[PDB]
């Protein structure tokens, strides 16, 4: 008996930004979804498609863990069918996404003096993003009709922008850690089940 390492992606020491969010698939273990809901340390535990209490019986063939840090007033944008500058340029959920999302506040680890400018998000982009797709790039977004040669000036700007993750901010500006669990069901039999 080998329990699934869901506490590895949850109690990690180095999370990722929203434009370069990490992803690794968990397989060949028995899941323990009871202690996650009964942990009493999370803020928003909502599902989309599956009942949140019916996880331990109806099982899936592969699970994905997408971990990234966003603001407090933008955790609603990670939901099936929402708009906003985070939901369309960094991370988009489709309509048929049959998984559960889970978020919690991370103020006691990602808020120090001086300001945390390491967490970066994408503000400018050419078009919207397809669901479940990341775009690591440093290409200058040409906003006006001037072709600039990768320089910083008028009508073309840098696409990334740092976060003001200072501990003196309001409760809506605190950095929030969110993990996306995507239960995908194939015609092949399941592997993580229990």
């Amino acid at each position, epitope marked *: 008996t080998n329990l699934c390492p869901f506490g590895e992606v949850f109690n990690a020491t180095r999370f990722a930004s929203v434009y370069a969010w990490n992803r690794k698939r968990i397989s060949n273990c028995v899941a323990d979804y009871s202690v996650l809901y009964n942990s009493a340390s999370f803020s928003t535990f909502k599902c989309y498609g599956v009942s949140p209490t019916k996880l331990n019986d109806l099982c899936f063939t592969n699970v994905y863990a997408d971990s990234f840090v966003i603001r407090g007033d933008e955790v609603r944008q990670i939901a099936p069918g929402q708009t906003g500058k985070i939901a369309d340029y960094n991370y988009k959920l489709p309509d048929d996404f049959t998984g559960c999302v889970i978020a919690w506040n991370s103020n006691n680890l990602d808020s120090k003096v001086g300001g945390n400018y390491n967490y970066r998000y994408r503000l400018f982009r050419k078009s919207n993003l397809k669901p479940f797709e990341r775009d690591i790039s440093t290409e200058i977004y040409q906003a*006006g*009709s*001037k072709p600039c040669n990768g320089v910083e*000036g*008028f*009508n073309c*700007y840098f696409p990334l922008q740092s976060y003001g993750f200072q501990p003196t901010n309001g409760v809506g500006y605190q950095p929030y850690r969110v993990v996306v669990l995507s239960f995908e069901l194939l015609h092949a039999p399941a592997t993580v089940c229990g």
Partner: antibody
Amino acid sequence: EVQLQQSGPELVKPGASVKISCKTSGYTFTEYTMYWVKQSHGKSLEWIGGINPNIGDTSYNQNFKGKATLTVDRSSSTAYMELRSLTSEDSAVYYCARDGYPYYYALDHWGQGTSVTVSS
Amino acid sequence: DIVMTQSQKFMSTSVGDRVSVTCKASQNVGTNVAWYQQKPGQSPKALIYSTSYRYSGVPDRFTGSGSGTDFTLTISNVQSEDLAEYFCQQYNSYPYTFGGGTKLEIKR
């Protein structure tokens, strides 16, 4: 229908300051970049500067640095140009524009023009 | 900055005639130039952008060619509505430098 409506003609004394408006309707005002120009009587055209409504970045001409400033009012979708230290050389018309880069263009899409004359 | 020179300033072509409006650049502008049309008293409207493409609502007889230094706005079948003021702009380096201007006339 995309429509740019400007103000009326203003008679002004030398040394004063005016505010020329260009109301916008029919498109998304936040993304598209707005330019401002100046056409003197009988001579060639000249460019002043451009302002970006989503950010606020400005890049004026070097001959109009201490001449004109630009402010954008997103609450009513109205841009403004404020001219300072007017002399007799500013007997010109002033147009507003609109960039067109997210439509595969190089468009300016000029407005109407405000005839601003100077006299004592 | 870029000095956009137009020569000459006056041109006289009758109706049903081919006319060519040219203007030069100082440095390597590339491809991104423009052309406009200004009725006397009215506001200027856009005709040609990036020296190969028209706009939405302009006639198809306004064609353009040339790259690098020389640019030409050639009109095939001119009309009475063709009489206007034609300018040329660049989009290479800020600030934008407009041209001089060329006025059309009817031969008599």
